[PDB]
């Protein structure tokens, strides 16, 4: 759904410019949960018509909200949770929040208790601003295919050059890290180690997908010599297996191992109690959105959120 979103958005972003030049333009589009926000000023009411088909035309649409005006930013988390305090990290992660000229448009699957909460507290941070609600209450396969590769590449990112990462190291391709050195040169030896040949610092996206496996390989056999991760791993799926991979990546195997009671109810498979409980962690607070993927991954089995 990341990846529909954003793949969507573009094409329509792109395709809707060509036809406005054809007769400096202003035009954005929005996507969440292949739900679509059409953003612009445009001349006549007929153009802005013709925008709202460019978009309806996506197979992949299950909605399109056109709000072009006739002649912008995303709220950051943060913004977002100075302004709903009192809502619930979980509740807050199936929010997106826009302003595009004097407008803020709030998009989300929510209960229609949390849409009247949502709505008040919005509408007092903006204060006399206009605030448009676009909430959703609680085949198509030429897109990209969601693999463990792709699912860590929207989680951490795909760099192609040596880059220092926050902690003052050195790092390559998905988190792959080089040296805790601050020499550069140490890195690029490592670098040209697990390549084999003269990188030069900078690496295809071939043999960045071949580190990748590396270090899949080396997560999965500290799964299996861990007491309390071997059991989980090996009950499980396989989606479901590169879910509880992601959250290694992030927090190394010994962090992991921390999650008790989360990690017995997946081996029991009770999808729905396990993610109630994982978004309750300081886990959900400091990377809600990559966790909210990786729990719904968990609550379905697919790759829903990542599509
Ligand atoms: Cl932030
Ligand atoms: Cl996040």
Same mark, same amino acid.
């Given at each position: 759904?990341?990846?529909?979103?954003? @793949?969507?958005?573009?094409?329509?972003?792109?395709?809707?410019?060509?036809?406005?030049?054809?007769?400096?333009?202003?035009?954005?589009?929005?996507?969440?949960?292949?739900?679509?926000?059409?953003?612009?000023?445009?001349?006549?009411?007929?153009?802005?018509?013709?925008?709202?088909?460019?978009?309806?035309?996506?197979?992949?649409?299950?909605?399109?909200?056109?709000?072009?005006? @006739?002649?912008?930013?995303?709220?950051?988390?943060?913004?977002?949770?100075?302004?709903?305090?009192?809502?619930?990290?979980?509740?807050?992660?199936?929010?997106? &929040?826009?302003?595009?000229?004097?407008?803020?448009?709030?998009?989300?699957?929510?209960?229609?208790?949390?849409?009247?909460?949502?709505?008040?507290?919005?509408?007092?941070?903006?204060? @006399?601003?206009?605030?448009?609600?676009?909430?959703?209450?609680?085949?198509?396969?030429?897109?990209?295919?969601?693999?463990?590769?792709?699912?860590?590449?929207?989680?951490?990112?795909?760099?192609?050059?040596?880059?220092?990462?926050?902690?003052?190291?050195?790092? &390559?391709?998905?988190?792959?890290?080089?040296?805790?050195?601050?020499?550069?040169?140490?890195?690029?030896?490592?670098?040209?180690?697990?390549?084999?040949?003269?990188?030069?610092?900078?690496?295809?996206?071939?043999?960045?997908?071949?580190?990748?496996?590396?270090?899949?390989?080396?997560?999965?056999?500290? &799964?299996?010599?861990?007491?309390?991760?071997?059991?989980?791993?090996?009950?499980?799926?396989? @989606?479901?297996?590169?879910?509880?991979?992601?959250?290694?990546?992030?927090?190394?195997?010994?962090?992991?191992?921390?999650?008790?009671?989360?990690?017995?109810?997946?081996?029991?498979?009770?999808?729905?109690?396990?993610?109630?409980?994982?978004?309750?962690?300081?886990?959900?607070?400091?990377?809600?959105?990559?966790?909210?993927?990786? &729990?719904?991954?968990?609550?379905?089995?697919?790759?829903?959120?990542?599509?």
């Amino acid at each position: 759904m990341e990846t529909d979103d954003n @793949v969507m958005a573009l094409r329509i972003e792109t395709t809707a410019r060509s036809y406005l030049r054809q007769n400096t333009p202003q035009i954005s589009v929005v996507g969440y949960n292949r739900h679509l926000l059409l953003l612009g000023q445009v001349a006549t009411e007929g153009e802005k018509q013709f925008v709202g088909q460019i978009a309806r035309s996506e197979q992949a649409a299950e909605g399109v909200y056109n709000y072009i005006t @006739v002649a912008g930013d995303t709220w950051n988390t943060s913004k977002v949770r100075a302004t709903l305090l009192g809502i619930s990290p979980a509740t807050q992660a199936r929010v997106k &929040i826009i302003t595009y000229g004097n407008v803020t448009y709030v998009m989300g699957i929510l209960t229609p208790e949390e849409q009247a909460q949502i709505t008040q507290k919005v509408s007092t941070t903006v204060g @006399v601003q206009k605030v448009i609600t676009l909430y959703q209450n609680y085949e198509n396969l030429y897109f990209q295919g969601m693999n463990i590769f792709e699912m860590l590449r929207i989680d951490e990112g795909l760099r192609l050059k040596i880059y220092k990462d926050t902690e003052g190291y050195y790092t &390559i391709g998905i988190g792959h890290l080089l040296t805790k050195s601050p020499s550069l040169n140490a890195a690029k030896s490592e670098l040209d180690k697990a390549i084999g040949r003269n990188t030069n610092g900078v690496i295809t996206k071939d043999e960045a997908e071949k580190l990748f496996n590396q270090d899949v390989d080396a997560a999965v056999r500290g &799964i299996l010599r861990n007491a309390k991760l071997k059991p989980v791993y090996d009950s499980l799926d396989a @989606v479901r297996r590169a879910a509880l991979i992601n959250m290694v990546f992030q927090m190394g195997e010994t962090g992991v191992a921390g999650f008790t009671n989360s990690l017995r109810m997946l081996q029991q498979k009770r999808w729905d109690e396990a993610a109630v409980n994982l978004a309750k962690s300081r886990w959900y607070n400091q990377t809600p959105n990559r966790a909210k993927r990786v &729990i719904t991954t968990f609550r379905t089995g697919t790759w829903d959120a990542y599509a």
